[PDB]
Design an enzyme around this catalytic site. Structure first.
Site, PDB file in Angstrom:
ATOM      1  N   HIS A  85      33.068  49.187  43.147  1.00  0.00           N
ATOM      2  CA  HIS A  85      33.347  50.192  42.479  1.00  0.00           C
ATOM      3  C   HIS A  85      33.490  50.196  40.993  1.00  0.00           C
ATOM      4  CE1 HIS A  85      35.864  46.434  42.698  1.00  0.00           C
ATOM      5  NE2 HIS A  85      36.272  45.889  40.896  1.00  0.00           N
ATOM      6  N   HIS A  87      34.772  48.253  37.949  1.00  0.00           N
ATOM      7  CA  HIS A  87      34.717  46.870  36.857  1.00  0.00           C
ATOM      8  C   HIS A  87      33.445  46.513  36.312  1.00  0.00           C
ATOM      9  CE1 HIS A  87      39.148  46.890  38.399  1.00  0.00           C
ATOM     10  NE2 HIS A  87      38.850  47.302  37.291  1.00  0.00           N
ATOM     11  N   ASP A  89      32.438  43.565  37.227  1.00  0.00           N
ATOM     12  CA  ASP A  89      32.480  42.084  38.539  1.00  0.00           C
ATOM     13  C   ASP A  89      31.371  43.483  38.777  1.00  0.00           C
ATOM     14  OD1 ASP A  89      34.793  43.343  39.202  1.00  0.00           O
ATOM     15  OD2 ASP A  89      34.833  41.793  40.742  1.00  0.00           O
ATOM     16  N   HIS A 150      42.283  47.574  45.466  1.00  0.00           N
ATOM     17  CA  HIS A 150      41.953  47.153  44.355  1.00  0.00           C
ATOM     18  C   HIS A 150      41.625  47.975  42.996  1.00  0.00           C
ATOM     19  CE1 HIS A 150      40.327  44.405  41.302  1.00  0.00           C
ATOM     20  NE2 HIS A 150      39.509  45.065  41.232  1.00  0.00           N
ATOM     21  N   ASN A 181      43.547  40.702  40.731  1.00  0.00           N
ATOM     22  CA  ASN A 181      43.946  41.030  39.020  1.00  0.00           C
ATOM     23  C   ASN A 181      43.604  42.676  39.432  1.00  0.00           C
ATOM     24  OD1 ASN A 181      43.117  42.598  37.101  1.00  0.00           O
ATOM     25  ND2 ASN A 181      41.737  41.452  35.954  1.00  0.00           N
TER      26      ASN A 181
HETATM   27  C1  LIG Z   1      36.139  42.239  36.326  1.00  0.00           C
HETATM   28  C2  LIG Z   1      37.503  42.072  36.789  1.00  0.00           C
HETATM   29  C3  LIG Z   1      38.177  40.406  36.611  1.00  0.00           C
HETATM   30  C4  LIG Z   1      38.479  39.863  35.881  1.00  0.00           C
HETATM   31  C5  LIG Z   1      39.147  38.307  36.145  1.00  0.00           C
HETATM   32  C6  LIG Z   1      39.554  38.216  37.175  1.00  0.00           C
HETATM   33  C7  LIG Z   1      39.504  39.167  38.765  1.00  0.00           C
HETATM   34  C8  LIG Z   1      39.445  38.977  39.687  1.00  0.00           C
HETATM   35  C9  LIG Z   1      40.152  37.706  40.460  1.00  0.00           C
HETATM   36  C10 LIG Z   1      41.278  37.163  39.982  1.00  0.00           C
HETATM   37  C11 LIG Z   1      41.792  36.082  40.330  1.00  0.00           C
HETATM   38  C12 LIG Z   1      41.251  35.834  41.836  1.00  0.00           C
HETATM   39  N1  LIG Z   1      41.422  34.476  42.562  1.00  0.00           N
HETATM   40  S1  LIG Z   1      43.085  33.277  42.601  1.00  0.00           S
HETATM   41  O1  LIG Z   1      41.942  33.587  40.723  1.00  0.00           O
HETATM   42  O2  LIG Z   1      42.280  32.469  42.990  1.00  0.00           O
HETATM   43  C13 LIG Z   1      44.127  34.702  43.088  1.00  0.00           C
HETATM   44  C14 LIG Z   1      44.559  34.513  44.428  1.00  0.00           C
HETATM   45  O3  LIG Z   1      45.693  33.766  44.305  1.00  0.00           O
HETATM   46  C15 LIG Z   1      45.395  33.267  43.154  1.00  0.00           C
HETATM   47  C16 LIG Z   1      40.485  36.549  42.575  1.00  0.00           C
HETATM   48  F1  LIG Z   1      39.921  36.687  43.652  1.00  0.00           F
HETATM   49  C17 LIG Z   1      39.664  37.346  41.555  1.00  0.00           C
HETATM   50  C18 LIG Z   1      39.664  40.203  40.051  1.00  0.00           C
HETATM   51  C19 LIG Z   1      39.538  40.563  41.455  1.00  0.00           C
HETATM   52  O4  LIG Z   1      40.854  40.671  42.060  1.00  0.00           O
HETATM   53  O5  LIG Z   1      38.987  41.635  41.930  1.00  0.00           O
HETATM   54  N2  LIG Z   1      38.572  41.115  39.129  1.00  0.00           N
HETATM   55  C20 LIG Z   1      39.080  40.803  38.331  1.00  0.00           C
HETATM   56  N3  LIG Z   1      38.931  43.200  36.385  1.00  0.00           N
HETATM   57  C21 LIG Z   1      38.617  43.358  34.623  1.00  0.00           C
HETATM   58  C22 LIG Z   1      40.284  44.803  34.489  1.00  0.00           C
HETATM   59  C23 LIG Z   1      39.568  45.660  34.118  1.00  0.00           C
HETATM   60  C24 LIG Z   1      41.126  45.709  33.764  1.00  0.00           C
HETATM   61  C25 LIG Z   1      40.507  46.456  32.082  1.00  0.00           C
HETATM   62  N4  LIG Z   1      42.857  46.494  31.864  1.00  0.00           N
HETATM   63  C26 LIG Z   1      41.545  44.532  34.070  1.00  0.00           C
HETATM   64  O6  LIG Z   1      40.556  44.551  36.290  1.00  0.00           O
HETATM   65  C27 LIG Z   1      39.418  43.656  37.331  1.00  0.00           C
HETATM   66  O7  LIG Z   1      39.662  43.564  38.078  1.00  0.00           O
HETATM   67 ZN   LIG Z   2      37.635  44.701  40.183  1.00  0.00          ZN
HETATM   68 ZN   LIG Z   3      36.749  42.293  41.977  1.00  0.00          ZN
END
Ligand SMILES: C[C@@H](c1cccc2c(-c3ccc(NS(=O)(=O)C4COC4)c(F)c3)c(C(=O)O)[nH]c12)N1C[C@]2(C[C@@H](CN)C2)OC1=O
Ligand SMILES: [Zn+2]
Ligand SMILES: [Zn+2]
Length: 232
Positions: A85, A87, A89, A150, A181
């Site tokens: 996707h 993002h 990551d 997601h 997220n």
């Molecule tokens: C790069 C990515 C991103 C950033 C920071 C964190 C995550 C997480 C994520 C966050 C938390 C947990 N695990 S935890 O903490 O234990 C949780 C589960 O229970 C409690 C996890 F596993 C993953 C994911 C994901 O979920 O894939 N992606 C992230 N971006 C940024 C953005 C673009 C938008 C710009 N407005 C915002 O959106 C996204 O996805």
């Molecule tokens: Zn993502």
């Molecule tokens: Zn992710």
């Protein structure tokens, strides 16, 4: 020492590989985002005497470190990469890959979203994935578009030789309490998209989330459960 590597075990900037099955590894890196540190996964699949990479290691420096770790541990060239996707990551590091001779791929939907949001942009478009339930072959994997979850563009990856299902960020690890997220997610459609994955890959033996520990098929149902509860 052999357990799956976790967030506090990987300094930001280093990468570790984990053998999943014959010719299948995950890659694990850590990154800071909005003042917190997170782990994230990708996949490496042996493609004869080359390698197929799934997803970057969440940034340029991490992705350079990934290439170095692959050369150390595996020693075969990465020739192609797919981002699942748009993002950071998944695509942050695509410029590093491209300048290291890797051909980078993503769906047209991912490419458009990355471009619009200012993320790095894979070079090549993957057609044939625009309708939910679509699947295409790409080297030693099958790419599958399950529908919005997601993100609207998220793809999953199946390694048929090993029955490995790489869910990317549409699939959460068993310990998760929240849906991660959700900024770009479709919580209403996500359970339907997971149901499509479950139906299409009933023989999966290992399921790998976008972040956190691999497990079995239960990750899919757990993901549906956490998403329904988050939305509730
Ligand atoms: C790069 C990515 C991103 C950033 C920071 C964190 C995550 C997480 C994520 C966050 C938390 C947990 N695990 S935890 O903490 O234990 C949780 C589960 O229970 C409690 C996890 F596993 C993953 C994911 C994901 O979920 O894939 N992606 C992230 N971006 C940024 C953005 C673009 C938008 C710009 N407005 C915002 O959106 C996204 O996805
Ligand atoms: Zn993502
Ligand atoms: Zn992710």
């Amino acid at each position: 020492s052999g357990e799956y590597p976790t967030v506090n075990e990987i300094p930001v900037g280093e990468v570790r590989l984990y053998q999943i099955a014959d010719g299948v590894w995950s890659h694990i890196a850590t990154q800071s985002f909005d003042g917190a540190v997170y782990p994230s996964n990708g996949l490496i699949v042996r493609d004869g005497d080359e390698l197929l990479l799934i997803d970057t290691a969440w940034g340029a420096k991490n992705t350079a470190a990934l290439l170095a770790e692959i050369e150390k541990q595996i020693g075969l060239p990465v020739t192609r990469a797919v981002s699942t996707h748009f993002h950071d990551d998944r695509v942050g590091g695509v410029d590093v890959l491209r300048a290291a001779g890797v051909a980078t791929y993503a769906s047209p939907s991912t490419r458009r979203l990355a471009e619009a949001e200012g993320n790095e942009i894979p070079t090549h478009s993957l057609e044939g994935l625009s309708s939910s339930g679509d699947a295409v072959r790409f080297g030693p994997v099958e790419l599958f578009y399950p529908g919005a979850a997601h993100s609207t563009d998220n793809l999953v990856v199946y390694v048929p030789s090993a029955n490995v299902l790489y869910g990317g960020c549409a699939v959460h690890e068993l310990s998760s309490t929240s849906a991660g997220n959700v900024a770009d997610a479709d919580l209403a459609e996500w359970p339907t998209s997971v149901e499509r994955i479950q139906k299409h890959y009933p023989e999966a033996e290992v399921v790998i989330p976008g972040h956190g520990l691999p497990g079995g098929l239960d990750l899919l149902q757990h993901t549906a459960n956490v998403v329904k509860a988050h939305k509730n």
